[PDB]
Amino acid sequence: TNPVTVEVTRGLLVESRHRGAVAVVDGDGKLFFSLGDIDTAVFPRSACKAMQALPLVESGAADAYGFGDKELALACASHNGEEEHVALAASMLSRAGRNVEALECGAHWSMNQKVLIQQARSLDAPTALHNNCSGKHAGFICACCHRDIDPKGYVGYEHPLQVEIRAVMERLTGAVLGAESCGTDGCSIPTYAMPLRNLAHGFARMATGTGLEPLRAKASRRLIEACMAEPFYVAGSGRACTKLMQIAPGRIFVKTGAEGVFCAAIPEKGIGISLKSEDGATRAAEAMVAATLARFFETEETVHAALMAFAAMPMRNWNGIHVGDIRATSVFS
Amino acid sequence: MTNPVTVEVTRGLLVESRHRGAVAVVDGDGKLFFSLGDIDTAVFPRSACKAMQALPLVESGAADAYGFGDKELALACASHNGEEEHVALAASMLSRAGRNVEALECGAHWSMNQKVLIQQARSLDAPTALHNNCSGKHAGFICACCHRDIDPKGYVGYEHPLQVEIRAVMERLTGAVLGAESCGTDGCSIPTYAMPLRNLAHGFARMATGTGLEPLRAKASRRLIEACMAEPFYVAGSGRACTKLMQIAPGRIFVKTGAEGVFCAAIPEKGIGISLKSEDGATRAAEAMVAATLARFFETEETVHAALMAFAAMPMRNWNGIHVGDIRATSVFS
Ligand SMILES: [Cl-]
Ligand SMILES: [Cl-]
Ligand SMILES: [Cl-]
Ligand SMILES: [Cl-]
Ligand SMILES: [Cl-]
Numbered sequence: 001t002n003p004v005t006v007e008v009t010r011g012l013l014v015e016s017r018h019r020g021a022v023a024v025v026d027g028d029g030k031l032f033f034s035l036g037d038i039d040t041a042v043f044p045r046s047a048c049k050a051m052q053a054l055p056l057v058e059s060g061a062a063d064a065y066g067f068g069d070k071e072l073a074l075a076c077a078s079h080n081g082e083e084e085h086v087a088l089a090a091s092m093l094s095r096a097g098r099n100v101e102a103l104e105c106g107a108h109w110s111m112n113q114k115v116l117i118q119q120a121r122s123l124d125a126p127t128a129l130h131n132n133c134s135g136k137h138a139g140f141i142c143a144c145c146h147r148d149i150d151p152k153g154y155v156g157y158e159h160p161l162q163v164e165i166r167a168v169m170e171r172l173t174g175a176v177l178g179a180e181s182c183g184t185d186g187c188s189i190p191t192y193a194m195p196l197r198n199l200a201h202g203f204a205r206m207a208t209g210t211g212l213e214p215l216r217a218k219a220s221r222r223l224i225e226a227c228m229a230e231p232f233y234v235a236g237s238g239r240a241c242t243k244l245m246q247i248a249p250g251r252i253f254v255k256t257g258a259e260g261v262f263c264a265a266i267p268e269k270g271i272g273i274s275l276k277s278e279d280g281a282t283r284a285a286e287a288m289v290a291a292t293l294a295r296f297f298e299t300e301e302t303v304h305a306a307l308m309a310f311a312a313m314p315m316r317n318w319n320g321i322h323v324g325d326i327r328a329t330s331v332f333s
Numbered sequence: 334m335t336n337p338v339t340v341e342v343t344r345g346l347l348v349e350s351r352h353r354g355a356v357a358v359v360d361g362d363g364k365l366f367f368s369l370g371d372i373d374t375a376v377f378p379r380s381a382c383k384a385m386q387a388l389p390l391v392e393s394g395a396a397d398a399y400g401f402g403d404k405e406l407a408l409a410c411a412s413h414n415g416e417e418e419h420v421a422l423a424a425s426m427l428s429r430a431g432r433n434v435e436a437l438e439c440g441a442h443w444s445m446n447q448k449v450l451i452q453q454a455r456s457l458d459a460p461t462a463l464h465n466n467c468s469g470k471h472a473g474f475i476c477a478c479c480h481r482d483i484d485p486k487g488y489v490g491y492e493h494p495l496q497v498e499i500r501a502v503m504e505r506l507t508g509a510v511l512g513a514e515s516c517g518t519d520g521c522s523i524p525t526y527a528m529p530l531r532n533l534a535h536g537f538a539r540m541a542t543g544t545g546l547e548p549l550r551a552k553a554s555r556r557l558i559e560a561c562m563a564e565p566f567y568v569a570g571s572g573r574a575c576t577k578l579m580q581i582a583p584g585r586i587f588v589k590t591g592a593e594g595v596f597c598a599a600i601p602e603k604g605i606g607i608s609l610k611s612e613d614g615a616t617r618a619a620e621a622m623v624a625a626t627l628a629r630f631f632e633t634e635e636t637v638h639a640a641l642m643a644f645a646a647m648p649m650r651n652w653n654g655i656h657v658g659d660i661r662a663t664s665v666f667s
């Protein structure tokens with residue numbers, strides 16, 4: 001039933017189509033704009049990494065280990081596995097008296113083609129540090145170590161870290177997080193399906209502080225402001241999240257999830273954004289978060305023009321010929 | 334009409350993502366055997382119709398003149414991984430026509446297969462036109478021109494006699510109208526022509542059976558389909574669905590992927606052609622859909638059926654090797 005949110009053209013015709021859902025919620029919980037089904041439970045995957053970084057800050061670990069915005073950004077990141085990402089994750093772990101062996105996420109090659117070419121040339125195999133979640137896992141291990149909680153088995157459903165993350169994420173989103181909503185993430189931690197409406201509300205609360213206690217309100221500001229200050233560390237070279245946060249420095253928060261999830265926030269407008277490409281395609285979610293953010297910057301021509309470049313992405317073939325476009329539909333008007 | 338949900342992607346107890354699409358199954362006589370969703374709206378077959386495009390290579394007399402075997406015919410029909418074996422053979426086909434990589438007008442790209450791109454990164458500064466998944470098809474085009482003494486320069490162009498011939502061939506096989514209105518530019522810079530899945534399926538069924546084809550075309554069609562089943566590594570390569578699906582039932586199943594979630598298939602002993610499209614263009618959806626479609630025809634061949642159903646319902650494991658959910662064709666296929 002979800003509307004067609006993205007078209008992919010070739011010649012004079014639409015070659016492929018994507019359906020999806022978009023929730024835009026203010027800090028008080030009012031729905032500002034919606035497309036399609038924002039009530040059915042959806043897996044946020046990596047899109048809610050900023051929510052999961054709150055124990056790192058709220059525990060006092062970030063302060064105890066003298067982390068700045070680059071380590072905060074990396075803990076909120078789906079990074080490319082570039083040398084800067086690896087080194088920082090290694091550094092975050094070392095400051096907690098730990099190494100790569102403490103990571104329980106496993107290893108993978110970069111999903112970014114140019115970075116995988118760099119990795120393939122310089123490595124026999126990637127390590128846990130090269131995992132896009134290695135920053136988030138580093139932050140988890142630091143959160144544990146700072147409070148003298150054994151980080152071994154931190155991925156486990158009833159490890160006190162995962163108990164803390166449920167409690168935090170239920171408070172932010174007002175969603176029920178439990179066994180029936182639970183799945184295993186690519187990094188072997190729990191991911192909880194919840195309505196896009198609730199996920200949007202969670203990010204609006206972090207962005208605005210509305211309904212949050214002072215410590216949580218402050219920790220949420222530090223994380224959102226870190227990602228916007230150090231956008232390379234959230235993603236990296238050639239990535240949409242990094243480029244989208246260089247359009248309007250310090251003003252727009254975005255984060256991708258696996259399976260075509262995007263979360264975003266505009267703290268100055270007090271709004272949180274969540275969305276899902278029903279088929280899970282990254283290119284669709286990317287076109288959709290751009291067209292959605294653009295609705296709020298129509299009277300800022302240069303920002304609007306920069307966002308609309310991601311909402312209407314040209315495709316060139318191997319000879320650099322324009323063959324067609326990836327275009328958000330009129331539903332974003 | 335809305336296309337039905339053909340593939341679900343699960344995580345824990347829930348459907349995380351879903352795909353819609355369409356399937357046409359047509360016999361040699363043009364009778365519809367099975368269909369899902371919209372099989373009348375024009376769809377770009379992209380690489381899925383490479384075997385139809387290989388007909389000038391055979392029918393011209395070029396394949397025989399240059400002593401091409403099943404491996405060369407398979408490669409001409411291929412979206413290959415850009416492995417050393419594919420590169421060497423594409424180089425060999427060009428060599429026999431008195432040409433080299435500089436004759437190719439497809440451009441260069443890194444392997445879309447992760448393991449092979451790693452090999453390529455470690456062995457190359459940059460790929461060449463030979464590394465292009467379409468280098469075999471383009472080698473065949475150039476070979477077809479060179480044999481008939483037609484200047485291969487500009488063979489990608491709409492009114493080059495090669496592209497005029499491909500149009501005439503594909504219109505005769507499919508019964509579809511191929512013109513500028515239905516034309517787009519493919520990833521390799523040649524024309525790709527949108528046509529109904531029903532017509533694409535009918536096309537492959539005529540190649541598979543020879544029904545309504547003149548003897549020359551019927552024989553070239555047989556040679557190409559038999560070559561791809563004989564040498565499935567040269568159609569795709571290491572770790573690829575097309576190669577593995579054509580090792581389930583050797584000599585019996587023809588499959589070919591197209592960009593944007595197209596699949597074509599054929600079971601010549603059953604007289605059927607298959608075409609399908611994941612509406613969102615996902616590869617994983619088109620793969621689950623072609624396997625679930627083929628499986629309907631092998632329900633009394635338990636070992637073939639179980640091998641196809643492994644692709645119809647593919648498990649997903651995370652970086653630690655933990656089963657997280659499945660990619661499953663829906664009950665519309667059973
Ligand atoms: Cl993930
Ligand atoms: Cl709170
Ligand atoms: Cl292509
Ligand atoms: Cl293309
Ligand atoms: Cl004919």
Ligand SMILES: [Zn+2]
Pocket residue numbers: 046133136185186187
């Ligand atoms: Zn993760």
Ligand SMILES: [Zn+2]
Pocket residue numbers: 380467470519520521523
């Ligand atoms: Zn091609």
